[PDB]
């Protein structure tokens, strides 16, 4: 099963094992850089054919770059 | 009605009552003057003893004095000075001496070789004893109605229960119904009730689908402790649920929504049948208990 | 997860577990609890931005809604995910009863 | 991970669209392309007096109306005039979500 | 319970279900949803006083704590108890797909 980077998984060397996809998103606040990495389970990828959570999510004001991948430890960008 | 006929040995659900007993004891701050801890065991062999403070400094460097009296030869499994009447450690001092079986003479038996007892405990008969390391400065007068969380003894008495087994193991989903009525003698609110899931043999793990209907009059919180069983776990209950870390890891835990389940055997069996849990394997109706040992068959 | 391990070592403005000690008699006036005198109950606090530990789909939708429409005041809220029991000692008349009170200490939060 | 694109997918529909630079496809179906490699295609046909517009999801490594998709990467759908007998024939393709909804001449 | 029958008919400042309609494309930017164009997702809002629909024991403790120590700002929060699914329609190529998205509409709240 897929091995993703997880910035909240303190207990497990910052990694989770997932059935869906690895996720990463970098938000541009003008006073800090936010790096959210996590797992997204198969049932939480809607619609499975084009999950919205992975979909282009760059709205006005926030330079947010969301990536989804299925290689082990791929969300390191 | 299934709820009124007694169960025997060949029942998957066995009702138990875990409690923490102590007959009498005292508590003092002697370190000011090695800490003296006395256990006056009675008759209802091996007993387990656990040592742990509130862990201020996390290390215990004062050697303790333990006086483990009993009217029985008992192998003391000390788990991470021991005046005794064997002790094992999976810096000891194994001494054999005649100890008085009266509590007041035993208390001053320690006063003869030591300054002032830190804690006295008279226990009835437990295989597990949980004992103090630290020293509360608030306080050695022994009292019949004394209890301190630090010094406790665990016993698990089996409870009577009615119910019946409806279906055999020749099914794809072993669904068990459990109807509790009172979890503890004293009723405050929202007390824990452990359900223990294990295979009947206890040798090889089991891939089983398990539905658990858990209904109680009093508001309980169910705690599922799955051991050597993996697969689908369906929990439907009128109360809340809790899951040990092994349960979520070994099994795929489906969750209740705090259903307004009906009361009685025939009603609860009907509900389970009208909701995809067919056929029901067993029904259990314990009047009072707070621990269930469920054994699965295949 | 947003558990005590993560929340206590990381300066987090957003939804996370917060430490709180509650003295039974001083903070609640509960003389009926004999041992202990207090416990670390903890609590969940902080805003729930989009995709931060969303409990259900509705909380992903609302977190996304409140991202584009912050004024709506309809956002997910920080809430205990995993709780743990606390063993207490209270007297019933003159009988000391050792009771394990379930769901007493918050150990992880979620955004629901 | 390449995910399927959102395209207007109404197949061949009649259109009152001509003598304009920009123009909306007026298609009511936004579809997720069955294959991730597909891109949005718009084709404009004015045979005699009847105009018709077609919106589909389509693999660019493949011909549409026996034509090779040249601009399968552009963001917007800029129509290029192809030559077909007795007919005014325009076609575009693009790689943005709903990019064949707003059609540029 | 604090469900839609009670919460929408009787005005309550405290924790209750609130009506909210979310337009998929206007409120979320969801071009991919064909039918419907939006849905009433609703949300939970309002303060959680002591014993008002307390989810767990910890929320009874915090609700009582925050009653006697209001300045602490560590109170239970209004949160969906029971949610219900929403059936949507979207196109994969030429195929209309009917999907029932679970946990989409909140129908009752609780204090956690």
Numbering used by the authors:
A (entry chain C): 31 to 107
B (entry chain E): 30 to 62, 65 to 75, 85 to 120, 130 to 134, 138 to 142, 149 to 197, 201 to 359
C (entry chain B), E (entry chain A): 301 to 412
D (entry chain D): 45 to 149
The paper states:
Betaglycan (BG) is a transmembrane co-receptor of the transforming growth factor-β (TGF-β) family of signaling ligands. It functions by enabling binding of the three TGF-β isoforms to their signaling receptors and is additionally required for inhibin A (InhA) activity. BG is nonetheless essential in vivo, where it binds and potentiates the activity of the three TGF-β isoforms (TGF-β1, -β2 and -β3) by presenting them to their signaling receptors, TGF-β receptor type I (TGFBR1) and TGF-β receptor type II (TGFBR2)4. BG, and a homologous co-receptor of the TGF-β family known as endoglin (ENG) which potentiates the function of BMP9 and BMP10, are transmembrane proteins with a large (approximately 760 amino acids) extracellular region comprised of two domains: the membrane-distal orphan domain and the juxtamembrane zona pellucida (ZP) domain19,20.
